[PDB]
């Protein structure tokens, strides 16, 4: 484990995702509202999945070597197995908050799968220049997601209860800022141009992951928007 300088950030990430999972699990014990139960189930699964994948990276299972640039490059593939399941769950939290229609939910989840799937292909591609073709396709899929979150959901939240509109607006802004950083870290990190070393890259993804999952969840599950209007 300790033979890799980035191990400290993988261990911290593992701990923070595990602690986040347990807090949400305990906090959700005393909840019977069927609407609130939906948000607790979605939001608790997110850091639980991330916990297992951070642990796999810490123990060395989620790491492979990819030859490109005449070098064997360490690629943590477990990140994409994490994101494949956690990013659509996070979008479902937002879509259920605004009572989005089914067709829009399917478009979001499908574009998200394309985003993560093409990012994985780009991470494992051995022809250096082709890695950035996949990065560009994946980034186009992300821009579609961000467009929908702004010019489809925002207008839908305003016609909703005030507390669900204000909570959505906050979580929307958090998501757009944090998610946009991921393609940048990829491009300048060891998967892309190799400007930033792997140990610093790992620290950046850990800060982003914890903020986008645990921080996101703390804002959502403390809001009254997750409960139905009741007397």
């Amino acid at each position: 484990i300790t033979g890799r300088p980035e191990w400290i950030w993988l261990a911290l990430g593992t701990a923070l995702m595990g602690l986040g999972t347990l807090y949400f699990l305990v906090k959700g014990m005393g909840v019977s509202d069927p609407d609130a139960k939906k948000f607790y189930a979605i939001t608790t699964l997110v850091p639980a999945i991330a916990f297992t994948m951070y642990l796999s990276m810490l123990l060395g299972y989620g790491l492979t070597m990819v030859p490109f640039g005449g070098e064997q490059n360490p690629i943590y593939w477990a990140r994409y197995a994490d994101w494949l399941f956690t990013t659509p769950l996070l979008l479902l939290d937002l879509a259920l908050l605004v009572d989005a229609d089914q067709g829009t939910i399917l478009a979001l989840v499908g574009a998200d799968g394309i985003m993560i799937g093409t990012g994985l292909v780009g991470a494992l591609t051995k022809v250096y220049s082709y890695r950035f073709v996949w990065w560009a396709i994946s980034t186009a899929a992300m821009l579609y997601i961000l467009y929908v979150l702004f010019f489809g959901f925002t207008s839908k939240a305003e016609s909703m209860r005030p507390e669900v509109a204000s909570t959505f607006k906050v979580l929307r802004n958090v998501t757009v800022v944090l998610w946009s950083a991921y393609p940048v870290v990829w491009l300048i990190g060891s998967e892309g141009a190799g400007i930033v070393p792997l140990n610093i890259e790992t620290l950046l993804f850990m800060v982003l992951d914890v903020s986008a999952k645990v921080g996101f969840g703390l804002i959502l599950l403390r809001s009254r928007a997750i409960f139905g209007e009741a007397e």
Copy 2:
């Protein structure tokens, strides 16, 4: 790229799926009917997924070598990753058109997963004679799907609006004819008996894919069956 004679058909397929995706995306911009939005989302995702997998084959990522018959045989595995997601989406288009019940939808999607999954196992199997055992199981799963589309959905469409009944009947006939060709191309192509060479096999799958996805989508999204009855 150009070192493979089949590259021209992979490049054409990539272009036609990309163009198809963009047309459906633009055409769906001016749509607010929640029913129509469902069909546009399903139908636009189909060629978008196929685009990415054709590109992976063009660039050489979606290709592996499988030893059988005393030879290293080029097997494009990316086809099955495509079909795993696009064939159930196409069946969902048909099932939603006739307002199929949930139990029937689950049976269709499950049989479809078995069809594609066993076809993938057959494509990667190293014992030559066993490849055709998997082909037979996969073909049995397809025949179940075709039976349901005829002796379960057809009777349901007649009790529906006339425009949804006539549109379903057309898309049903297109699907049964085109899908039935796939097991035949597999059997006589490089995955099976090896009668037809890979470059011709690739041309045939490209014609079938574009027809079953883009051609299918053009018929559906030009129909009024996708809109609810409104004044």
Copy 3:
């Protein structure tokens, strides 16, 4: 095939899953109740999936070698591909029986995915002591599932029709007893401590699989709880 002593139990399992699939398929022909169709579709898919994965193990495709303990250990990875899809389908049978809320269904299916996913990682892990870390995480996920089936569903079934309450109680008890045996067989078998040899381990999993899928299905599909109350 016959070069492996466990082949006899893989062949028996294949036959019993295939026969089970055909019986459920025939029995479900004469069913039009939309509620009953749901249970028949879920319950017939379970042994059909298991059939294909037992066949892959029989023919040698679903087997790999994992080095640990200074030895190349035969690991049947196809079991986890089976369980990944069949265990959530079995939980869906139970959840639909008691009309569970959506949030609870998602929590069950998500915990089940974590259970199977971490068990697969543990089966393929090359550092011997780490294999049991994954076993423990997977077992914690199972205990969560069992808790929900007892202290969330049981109370919900009592407020239901008497026949659905008594049928659920029976299937609940069958599930908790049979599922609990799996982590024990893993721990003492070739994936874990290696006390029980592989051929005996394979026999035990076959008895458990057939009972948990075909036996489970025979109890459910003979009950009147799967039909709506009708005159």
